[PDB]
Amino acid sequence: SALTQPASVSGSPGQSITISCTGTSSDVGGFNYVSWFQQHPGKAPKLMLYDVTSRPSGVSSRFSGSKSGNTASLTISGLQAEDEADYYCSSHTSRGTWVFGGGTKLTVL
Amino acid sequence: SQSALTQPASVSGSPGQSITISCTGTSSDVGGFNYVSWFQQHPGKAPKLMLYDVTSRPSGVSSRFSGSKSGNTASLTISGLQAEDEADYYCSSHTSRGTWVFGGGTKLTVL
Amino acid sequence: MRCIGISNRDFVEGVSGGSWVDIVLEHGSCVTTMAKNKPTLDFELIKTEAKHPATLRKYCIEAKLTNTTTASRCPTQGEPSLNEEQDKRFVCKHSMVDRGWGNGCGLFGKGGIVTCAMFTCKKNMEGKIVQPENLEYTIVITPHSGEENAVGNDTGKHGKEIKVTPQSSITEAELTGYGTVTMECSPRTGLDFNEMVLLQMENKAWLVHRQWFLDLPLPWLPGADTQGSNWIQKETLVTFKNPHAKKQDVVVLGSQEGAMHTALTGATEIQMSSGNLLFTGHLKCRLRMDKLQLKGMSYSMCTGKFKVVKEIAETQHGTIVIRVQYEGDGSPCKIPFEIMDLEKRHVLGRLITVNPIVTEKDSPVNIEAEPPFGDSYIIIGVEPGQLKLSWFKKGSSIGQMFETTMRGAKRMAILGDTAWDFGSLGGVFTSIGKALHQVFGAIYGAAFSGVSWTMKILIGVVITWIGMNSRSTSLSVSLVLVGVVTLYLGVMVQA
Amino acid sequence: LGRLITVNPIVTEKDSPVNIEAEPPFGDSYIIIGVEPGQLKLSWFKKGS
Amino acid sequence: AVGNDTGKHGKEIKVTPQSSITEAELTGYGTVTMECSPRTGLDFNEMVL
Amino acid sequence: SVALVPHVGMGLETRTETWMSSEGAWKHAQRIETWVLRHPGFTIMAAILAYTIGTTYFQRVLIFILLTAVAPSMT
Amino acid sequence: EVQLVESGAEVKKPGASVKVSCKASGYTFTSYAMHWVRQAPGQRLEWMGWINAGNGNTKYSQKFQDRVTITRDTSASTAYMELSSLRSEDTAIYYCARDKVDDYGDYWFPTLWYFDYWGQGTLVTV
Amino acid sequence: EVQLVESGAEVKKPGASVKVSCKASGYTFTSYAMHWVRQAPGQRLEWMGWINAGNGNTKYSQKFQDRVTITRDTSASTAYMELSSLRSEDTAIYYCARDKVDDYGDYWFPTLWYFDYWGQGTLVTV
Ligand SMILES: *[C@@H]1O[C@H](CO)[C@@H](O)[C@H](O)[C@H]1NC(C)=O
Structure with a gap:
């Protein structure tokens, strides 16, 4: 039931890179409980997006979220070196549980 | 399938003259409709569409190539025969049965 | 161009103050709009696509039974108990079979029995739903440029294709040389689509009524059901047999695909395999002709001979089309075209391909015009080598009025009150007629929903008779009018 | 045709979405946001009476 | 806003029979006064928990 | 059966042909005609009953037609 | 710039089957019907059939209705044509002509300008 | 400041049990539900369950349902995650994330910004 994400992703600095989170009709295709978490090595996950698109107060505006059918997407526009991290997608399912993506490792180089 | 359109085996004409090629079909392929297209086949090269809709020609084709239809027979005319006009000319049609039929093939010789 | 020979072609003439006209677009139809000093354009709704639909309910059309079990209890000792009755995969039923010393019971009477077989679905039909905000109408706008191949509508290569979505009310198409056209369509x-389901069953899809779809007497699963085994009304697809009150059996009824096909008689078929694209329904749009201008109006008239390359043909709509090759000089020139009378005293016809021009000498040009009823002459070119092509129309203006009245009546019978939007310029009479039509259509749809055309015919006959046999002249007339309209709608329905 | 409910909607920060609630009329109505350049016109139909 | 270092837009007022008049200070919108009658x-003299 | 509740009279019709409009337009009439042919006995009883519940030929004809239309349908 | 690239020339025994591809680039591959025209060396052209790349529907001539199969890769933007039960008389150049389907995605009536673009021709020997 | 702090890393042997705590400060502990999320070394985040500090209600993942016990200490504003019968697969960082409950005190529908604040992460090895 884990949300499916690409294993890895890489984008040249200053470009835009997109990440996909494909789920079922219950987790990410049924509800707007879609959240994106950024986790730097050795650190706890950081809430990057929520409600599909809304981003936390401190979170940059370079991060944009989209959802289409059973798939939610995260896009990064600046591709700074500090953006290189591991990104996890989560959704609150219809049965009242939380499912997480497999996580994508974003690399600038 | 069907029966291949019958055109003369070969044609020749002095350079600069007017030479026509016939294309005889039944009432189901050539007589029935206007899906009559002419193709120019140079040796070792893929056929090139010269005429479609009987008289129409695709962009980039000389106006010397003109087409006409009469009953069950389609005619291809060339004005001012040149040295480039030494390819095999094939007439095709879209049969009412839903297939395509090609003529035997006329080889025009300038001289 | 792209709209001749469709046979469901309508002609919208004129725009109001503001240069806008209301046009209703339908699938399988085409609209050609003409206004003074503006190019004639062809509009056609060629696709409605519903994206990312959510499945609402699964229905079982082909099941099977397995692991059948049975249990009995001696008479007057209550009910038999089966473990399989514990889970809802097993379809069960209780019944009474007489028992006595022969069976193994100590007393005689009707002992309870229960049969339980596992229920599995072999084939299901999925009914999906789509939000009105996830539709994407496609419209091809084709100018009457007179291009050689423009008559062939299917390709639509040189016609601009605009995608209308409820996200933005305004769609702008830039037609090269013609300016831009602005469409304000109303997909909502x-x-x-809030009241309809996209029922798909074995590589065929239908657009059905949502309540009808939820009324289907088949075993169903919720739209979001992962297991796939908790079918709700399984008893609609199994039968329990107790012929002689000796033993009870359960059998599966049989594949319901054909019965479903019969049930889907009045639905419109749609496509569901490669995207949920469905070719049915209409679309009201508002056409902004403000930024729309004629092409090649700065060219000079052609001074040379024209030859006809395709003979004059009569379109199904009372218009004539003709292709003319150009042979003179001044390659980008304007084709002198007019439909005169025999003596050329005055112009009789009306060009539909306004401002025909030969852009390239070699490329032929297709010109469409609307000749008058009777004898007319199509004059083409200047006097030296001028073409004069006689034509006859074989019709009457009274006949054209009857045909137009019948076509408008059919449009009202199909679009209801949306008919008043077709070619409307926002007139006061148009608004009042549309509001009255909305009221009467609501009443009529309440009173006539769910019946067949034969029932409509019967009701119309009865109402007409009641009106005829009515003392009141007013009530008689109103009842007769209602009956006649009902009879017309019954005749024109189921299509 | 309609009166908005989130009265005086304002933007405090550029990268800060603001959600407006408004009461449209019954039937066809159009929600207009912004000014002439790139103004976004939204259609809506209110089904009641 | 999720950043909880600043928490706004959450004014709750407690109303008691002794203090039945209280004002909320909605930041940016002034203040609102509620004159309630809990009694x-x-x-609750004819009710049992 | 699902076949006993067709998607007819639902107000969703357009210009495009429906699923089985041509075929199913006259299926009911054909079925009622065949039933009347095969079962002439009930038709005579229906006519007699309609005449008995009369007072008007419109009433009698309507009642007889309704009974004949409902005899196969009730099945 | 629409170019149809075909597989390299092949030579195979009569009992073998040859599959020739025709990659489509420069136009929407799924909106065009890929035809296959056979021309024996020194003979007239022969229409085998067409495959609707949009919906995979195929048509065949009665000559090759049983010995010919045409397939297209929507993702690969290539249309395949395999001919089994080969014969020496089967030797010919196989081209891939192009035609456009209508706006409803079905290939009912060909455009009048069909076969406007051909392949370079693939040679098959037996 | 709303900081969440968890107990330190611990080393346990297979078949043992481990208790991890998450101390919540800077906010009303009773107003939020506490979630436990574990991440194996170099693998995806995994949700285990939540505890409603307001009433002690809990919901566990179908996995971990029989092994994990979640408890809270209203006095200390602390939450605990007891994992019993540790196996080799249970070595991972165990994070705590909060989500506010509604004004009724019932936590069934989360807030859109669930898991906005996380604990530093407690490492457990077997
Ligand atoms: C049903 O019967 C099959 C053998 O026909 C058996 O393999 C299966 O376990 C049985 N299941 C139940 C639930 O009885």
Whole structure:
């Protein structure tokens, strides 16, 4: 039931890179409980997006979220070196549980 | 399938003259409709569409190539025969049965 | 161009103050709009696509039974108990079979029995739903440029294709040389996809009524059901047999695909395999002709001979089309075209391909015009080598009025009150007629929903008779009018 | 045709979405946001009476 | 806003029979005064928990 | 059966042909005609009953037609 | 710039089957019907059939209705044509002509300008 | 400041049990539900369950349902995650994330910004 994400992703600095989170009709295709978490090595996950698109107060505006059918997407526009991290997608399912993506490792180089 | 359109085996004409090629079909392929297209086949090269809709020609084709239809027979005319006009000319049609039929093939010789 | 020979072609003439006209677009039809000093354009709704639909309910059309079990209890000792009755995969039923010393019971009477077989679905039909905000109408706008191949509509290569979505009310198409055309379409007041399901069953899809779809007497699963085994009304697809009150059996009824096909008689078929694209329904749009200008109006008239390359043909709509090759000089020139009378005293016809021009000498040009009823002459070119092509129309203006009245009546019978939007310029009479039509259509749809055309015919006959046999002249007339309209709608329905 | 409910909607920060609630009329109505350049016109139909 | 270092838009007012008049200070919108009558909402002298 | 509740009279019709409009337009009439042919006995009883519940030929004809239309349908 | 690239020339025994591809680039591959025209060396052209790349529907001539199969890769933007039960008389150049389907995605009536673009021709020997 | 702090890393042997705590400060502990999320070394985040500090209600993942016990200490504003019968697969960082409950005190529908604040992460090895 884990949300499916690409294993890895890489984008040249200053470009835009997109990440996909494909789920079922219950987790990410049924509800707007879609959240994106950024986790730097050795650190706890950081809430990057929520409600599909809304981003936390401190979170940059370079991060944009989209959802289409059973798939939610995260896009990064600046591709700074500090953006290189591991990104996890989560959704609150219809049965009242939380499912997480497999996580994508974003690399600038 | 069907029966291949019958055109003369070969044609020749002095350079600069007017030479026509016939294309005889039944009432189901050539007589029935206007899906009559002419193709120019140079040796070792893929056929090139010269005429479609009987008289129409695709962009980039000389106006010397003109087409006409009469009953069950389609005619291809060339004005001012040149040295480039030494390819095999094939007439095709879209049969009412839903297939395509090609003529035997006329080889025009300038001289 | 792209709209001749469709046979469901309508002609919208004129725009109001503001240069806008209301046009209703339908699938399988085409609209050609003409206004003074503006190019004639062809509009056609060629696709409605519903994206990312959510499945609402699964229905079982082909099941099977397995692991059948049975249990009995001696008479007057209550009910038999089966473990398989514990889970809802097993379809069960209780019944009474007489028992006595022969069976193994100590007393005689009707002992309870229960049969339980596992229920599995072999084939299901999925009914999906789509939000009115996830539709994407496609419209091809084709100018009457007179291009050689423009008559062939299917390709639509040189016609601009605009995608209308409820996200933005305004769509702007830039037609090269013609300026731009602005469309303000209303996808929300179209087919009402909040009240319809996209029923797909074995590589065929239908657009059905939502309540009808939820009334289907088949075993079903919720739209979001992962297991796939908790079918709700399984008893609609199994039968329990107790012929002689000796033993009870359960059998599966049989594949319901054909019965479903019969049930889907009045639905419109749609495509569901490669995207949920469905070719049915209409779309009201508003056409902004403000930024729309004629092409090649700065060219000079052609001074040379024209030859006809395709003979004059009569379109199904009372218009004539003709292709003319150009042979003179001044390659980008304007084709002198007019439909005169025999003596050329005055112009009789009306060009539909306004401002025909030969852009390239070699490329032929297709010109469409609307000759008058009777004898007319199509004059083409200047006097030296001028073409004069006689034509006859074989019709009457009274006949054309009857045909137009019948076509408008059919449009009202199909679009209801949306008919008043077709070619409307926002007139006061148009608004009042549309509001009255909305009221009467609501009443009529309440009173006539769910019946067949034969029932409509019967009701119309009865109402007409009641009106005829009515003392009141007013009530008689109103009842007769209602009956006649009902008879017309019954005749024109189921299509 | 309609009166908005989130009265005086304002933007405090550029990268800060603001959600407006408004009461449209019954039937066809159009929600207009912004000014002439790139103004976004939204259609809506209110089904009641 | 999720950043909880600043928490706004959450004014809750407690109303008691002794203090039935209280004002909320909605940041940016001034203040609102509620003059409530808790003694009439429910007759807790004729009710048992 | 699902076949006993067709998607007819639902107000969703357009210009495009429906699923089985041509075929199913006259299926009911054909079925009622065949039933009347095969079962002439009930038709005579229906006519007699309609005449008995009369007072008007419109009433009698309507009642007889309704009974004949409902005899196969009730099945 | 629409170019149809075909597989390299092949030579195979009569009992073998040859599959020739025709990659489509420069136009929407799924909106065009890929035809296959056979021309024996020194003979007239022969129409085998067409495959609707949009919906995979195929048509065949009665000559090759049983010995010919045409397939297209929507993702690969290539249309395949395999001919089994080969014969020496089967030797010919196989081209891939192009035609456009209508706006409803079905290939009912060909455009009048069909076969406007051909392949370079693939040679098959037996 | 709303900081969440968890107990330190611990080393346990297979078949043992481990208790991890998450101390919540800077906010009303009773107003939020506490979630436990574990991440194996170099693998995806995994949700285990939540505890409603307001009433002690809990919901566990179908996995971990029989092994994990979640408890809270209203006095200390602390949450605990007891994992019993540790196996080799249970070595991972165990994070705590909060989500506010509604004004009724019932936590069934989360807030859109669930898991906005996380604990530093407690490492457990077997
Ligand atoms: C049903 O019967 C099959 C053998 O026909 C058996 O393999 C299966 O376990 C049985 N299941 C139940 C639930 O009885």
